[PDB]
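PROTOCOL LOG
Step 1. Enter all chains and additional molecules of the complex.
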Amino acid sequence: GILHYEKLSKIGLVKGITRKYKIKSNPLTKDIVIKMIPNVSNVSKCTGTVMENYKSRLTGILSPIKGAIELYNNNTHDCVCMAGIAIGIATAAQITAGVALYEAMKNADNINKLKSSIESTNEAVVKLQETAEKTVYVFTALQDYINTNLVPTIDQIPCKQTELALDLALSKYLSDLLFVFGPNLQDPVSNSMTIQAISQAFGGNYETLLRTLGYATEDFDDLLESDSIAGQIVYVDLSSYYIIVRVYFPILTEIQQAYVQELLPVSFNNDNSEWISIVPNFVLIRNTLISNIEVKYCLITKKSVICNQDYATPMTASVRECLTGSTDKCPRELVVSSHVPRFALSGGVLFANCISVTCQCQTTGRAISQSGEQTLLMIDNTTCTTVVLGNIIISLGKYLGSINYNSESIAVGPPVYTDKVDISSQISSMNQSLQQSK
Amino acid sequence: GILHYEKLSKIGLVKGITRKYKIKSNPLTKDIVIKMIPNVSNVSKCTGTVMENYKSRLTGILSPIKGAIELYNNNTHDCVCMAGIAIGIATAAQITAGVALYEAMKNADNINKLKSSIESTNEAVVKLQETAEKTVYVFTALQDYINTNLVPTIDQIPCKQTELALDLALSKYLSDLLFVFGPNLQDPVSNSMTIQAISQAFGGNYETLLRTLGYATEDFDDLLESDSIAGQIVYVDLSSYYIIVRVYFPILTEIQQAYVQELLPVSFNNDNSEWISIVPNFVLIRNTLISNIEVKYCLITKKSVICNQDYATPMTASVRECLTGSTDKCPRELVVSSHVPRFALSGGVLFANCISVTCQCQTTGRAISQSGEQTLLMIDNTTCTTVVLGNIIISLGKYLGSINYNSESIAVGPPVYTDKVDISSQISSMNQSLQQSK
Amino acid sequence: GILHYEKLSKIGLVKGITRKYKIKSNPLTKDIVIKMIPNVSNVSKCTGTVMENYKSRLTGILSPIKGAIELYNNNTHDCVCMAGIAIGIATAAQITAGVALYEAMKNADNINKLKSSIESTNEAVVKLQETAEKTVYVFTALQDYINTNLVPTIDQIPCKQTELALDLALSKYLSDLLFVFGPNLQDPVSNSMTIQAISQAFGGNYETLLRTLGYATEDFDDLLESDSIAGQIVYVDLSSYYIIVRVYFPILTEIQQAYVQELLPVSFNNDNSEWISIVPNFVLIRNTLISNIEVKYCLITKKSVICNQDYATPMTASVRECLTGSTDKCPRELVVSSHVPRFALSGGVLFANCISVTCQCQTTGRAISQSGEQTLLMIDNTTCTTVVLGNIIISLGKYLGSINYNSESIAVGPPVYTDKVDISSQISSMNQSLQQSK
Ligand SMILES: *[C@@H]1O[C@H](CO)[C@@H](O)[C@H](O)[C@H]1NC(C)=O
Ligand SMILES: *[C@@H]1O[C@H](CO)[C@@H](O)[C@H](O)[C@H]1NC(C)=O
Ligand SMILES: *[C@@H]1O[C@H](CO)[C@@H](O)[C@H](O)[C@H]1NC(C)=O
Ligand SMILES: *[C@@H]1O[C@H](CO)[C@@H](O)[C@H](O)[C@H]1NC(C)=O
Ligand SMILES: *[C@@H]1O[C@H](CO)[C@@H](O)[C@H](O)[C@H]1NC(C)=O
Ligand SMILES: *[C@@H]1O[C@H](CO)[C@@H](O)[C@H](O)[C@H]1NC(C)=O
Ligand SMILES: *[C@@H]1O[C@H](CO)[C@@H](O)[C@H](O)[C@H]1NC(C)=O
Ligand SMILES: *[C@@H]1O[C@H](CO)[C@@H](O)[C@H](O)[C@H]1NC(C)=O
Ligand SMILES: *[C@@H]1O[C@H](CO)[C@@H](O)[C@H](O)[C@H]1NC(C)=O
Ligand SMILES: *[C@@H]1O[C@H](CO)[C@@H](O)[C@H](O)[C@H]1NC(C)=O
Ligand SMILES: *[C@@H]1O[C@H](CO)[C@@H](O)[C@H](O)[C@H]1NC(C)=O
Ligand SMILES: *[C@@H]1O[C@H](CO)[C@@H](O)[C@H](O)[C@H]1NC(C)=O
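Step 2. Run joint prediction.
Step 3. Record the structure below.
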């Protein structure tokens, strides 16, 4: 690759798995209905004031979301035609989500004609014919719990306990719902809300939601774990207590001439001390351009790095030069923890710090020795066919690089400290020196 | 406001929603009892050794908490009168919590006179008359589960399976409880423990707790999501296995002459490349003082920023000058990701980077062009009444700033890189240069 | 200790609790079987296609894990001998985990001889005789739910609702399972994944797992909360849908001549302003060596700091000199928030910023005054026996340090700003100054 792997390997940074870059795109939209209140028609004998109190509590949660949705519904018309003077302040994502909301209102209007049928649902999952060809699924929360726990036990227990059990179930449902659908949800007009978060209105059963929707594909689990499947609330009903959610199932596009290269950090010896290299562990290479990538927001598999959006971030010229060969530009940090890697395997070849760990060859019985002028030792089956590292015995391959690897040395970079307080102290010391300098 | 909004918008910092500052204060205290063990009197036929093992396991969890509480209970008198010699080491928060614990012990002593009544509770929520006027609520864990699942199925299933079901429910209850009430809780003498965390002793039903306690308030959900409602364990019983928790319910005070200003980041063009501005997105302004605010610990709504404590943090003079007009002091960062904003709306006026995106006007049909010397374009209805951005059509309004906005240019700040490894490399390179100079 | 506690306290770093350092070591291994599919033989009348669909969905989840495990199984032989040529790329942790997997395969082969007995399990927890002396426990998911909820209600409700209830339970089980056992688990050959994460295959009942395994020890909860108890998947069956997990039980080893010292930050007055000190709050001292420690990954109790591995990190020379007495090297930060501590107690002695908070003595009735040249006031019973801080009254001990503490002053360190944008701006400004100089 573009990176100088041979020079990188001598300061740790052993070449790891090469993964292709995938980003979701081209979503397909399906509409579902989540009914936030169960049907207690069959336990209504002693529901008491529990349902009235629950409806009063749920109206206060659903009302701000509805108001924020009609804020964009009222100011979007047909020339998608948005009035910026009434909207006032919005971001590009908010305006795009408003456009998507306007597009979804066409189907929401057809769905809303089945309000009585939605009210009459008495099962957790039901199918309704929105049109002659389109079917809408209604997902009722706690309906399964009521049907399988409260209906069979109405006449067995004093149903004053059924009222308390129903009250506790509704409040526990609200307890899990409040983190996602509460005041934290200040921007319901957005398509970045994952289906897992939306499923909290259905008890967290996004598996049931997606399986019922019939979304079958090879990349289903990858899309789920990359947070690429998203839902958007397009309508809120305060009389029947249900929401219409549009689920956007996209497909993964492999970015052409793009891959993510992983570097395995290995401690190396320098100046009679143990060091580690402070460089990005994951490097994104698009065409011939080298840049950082925030892989913590992505899904990392053994074959590809999967993200819901482009997470590329800039890279300094010094770090780019370090990755392209200038090993003197690579920052390094002292090693004081005993639990730090000291060897790694790449292409059947072992890169080990044989000063911190004991390297012994099984073929000859003689220990492999590392001098004080060598940072790492490259052990292939030319040096000797089988090396022993304590309880580990490994058969080695042949190195595809230079034959004088262990004879040719390099230069090491400047030591650094990556702790927050240490960074602040370094900045202070450098400023107290720079004031004298200038 | 005090900020220079025009110059900030010229570098892509578009003015956002202005929110007032709210901090909780003046809490009212209520005492509740949480019984960590259910009443199995009606399933006692084949509970077996399960209850003995559960009590043995729960004693080891509750003993350190009781010891830590008695550490402060034993060293507080009337001469709130605290003996610092015996306490030894404590913080201001710990001492204030000890004072609150001493205040709560007066009511805890009255509550403890109903120990037999607490032991005899056989419902999830019961009401006990602590005095002639005060009422205390007892919340029993898994009591509803036992009453609605195990009691009705005593004679139907082989009750050796009931013993296994009871054992699994208790162990699952301990599994969720251990993260909050385990060795992590090293400081039970503190009033910073949220009611949501305390509710883990009741299966996570803080909604049930707060609804039973009453607590009718408009700011109820805001207080819940700002982590302002807190509870404190004031007494632990190792014989009846219950705890007394004092719930603190504060009110939200709007800080006078204080508001939080949000800045919407928009990419801008400079030197034939795309850049973003590295400035705080949320700026707290109290009176005429500008400072940072850690909004990640607060609750953000469309109307206010709500925090459980003051989260103001200092700001550098350079950043303050950047926010007050000195745009040459504003750090900027290169843009390499495709998924960063290019336009935003503020006051009916669109600030767009018409080089990265296509700006076309519907009224005239001609594309809106941005020269290479302009960072951003301000598009108001004085220019043209309706702009088109791909699939988005927006009606704009008059701008309230300078009429020569698109003719007047500004200066741009120094480029920076905000990655961790990039920061370390920059610090090392700058130290190398400084050492070479001196 | 090695730290200069007096000078540290004079800049608001009051000595806290001294905790010893503990790291897990010498694990003992026990093998368990988790059956990912329940036995629905007693509700098979109307399970329908639900079980077939669930098996199809679960095969896709479990197949990559089995493939990754067989990747190491196929390339490990008795000759522990590993073929590095076929492995290609691996880290030291991966190779050690492969060695552990090879060691566990010997017992996995004996366990797999009871495949029919594992298939026939119809209880949540059962005991099987793997050999004449060894015992293996099988944990079946949702088996208790089926036995106690679906079997008793087979003929009471329309069993078409039983099929929907079974479908929802299986899908909810998969929803919780997907985060741990989904595409995120790209490296099943590793012994660093905790038993709590493993328990997600059993509904999160790690308490049941460990109690059934019979692991009884004093440090049980400490090992649990330090993330020291870990499990490794050693075998995956795609025909019976179960996994074999080897649980590692380490012991907590107290590091000799090592302890973690905590410093309590207290605001202090300087130049008519309030400041805080930016130094590490937790300092790890091993022998005579001072270094940082990442205590966020560890478990902190009142007696010791417990970690699953060594988390020591380097410390700069400037920060070390600050901790050892050079108070002019200690970075300090301005105080703008009202909710920052102003006093603390250590050894019965109060260190308070009496400029910011009102200090009054009860014994004499006269207020304690702090001059503008003093950062903090040390108040012991030599000064006066009982101090009052608002609603707090504390009896004080005697200071064991210098008697001229409040008369001797020190020098203060350079001011710093710890915000991210502030750090970037400071770096840019210092680079601009350095470039102007050179
Ligand atoms: C939107 O318009 C409806 C009437 O169509 C009105 O009831 C509602 O209050 C409006 N909401 C907003 C936010 O303007
Ligand atoms: C409610 O009860 C009636 C009569 O007992 C029954 O026909 C109906 O199916 C029940 N509803 C549900 C959802 O089971
Ligand atoms: C050494 O490893 C290489 C792998 O590159 C392999 O082809 C070769 O057979 C091995 N043995 C020898 C003696 O080269
Ligand atoms: C700067 O470098 C010198 C020598 O290279 C070193 O002694 C000093 O500690 C370094 N300081 C910082 C803040 O990096
Ligand atoms: C507190 O005092 C009680 C007796 O009133 C005693 O049993 C207990 O052990 C003491 N605890 C501590 C921490 O001193
Ligand atoms: C326990 O059983 C008795 C007799 O069947 C009954 O009177 C009592 O109400 C039951 N307890 C509860 C809490 O239901
Ligand atoms: C531009 O919008 C303002 C309101 O913001 C309006 O008063 C003015 O007449 C508009 N000019 C047009 C439509 O040309
Ligand atoms: C400092 O600024 C110069 C020019 O402004 C630039 O070339 C260099 O990369 C910068 N270095 C750092 C560490 O900011
Ligand atoms: C399944 O049903 C049979 C016949 O009713 C019964 O003997 C057996 O115990 C049941 N299985 C379980 C696990 O209860
Ligand atoms: C491992 O070997 C088995 C046969 O023993 C084979 O079925 C399987 O595909 C192999 N897996 C890998 C990753 O080589
Ligand atoms: C002051 O505190 C010390 C420390 O415990 C104590 O020994 C002494 O009795 C106290 N009183 C006096 C008058 O020294
Ligand atoms: C450097 O120090 C000077 C005076 O000591 C100060 O004015 C300036 O703000 C500091 N710059 C930093 C900390 O970036």
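Step 4. Note key features.
The longest helix of chain C spans residues 50-74.
Chain C touches chain B through 72 residues (CB under 8 Å).
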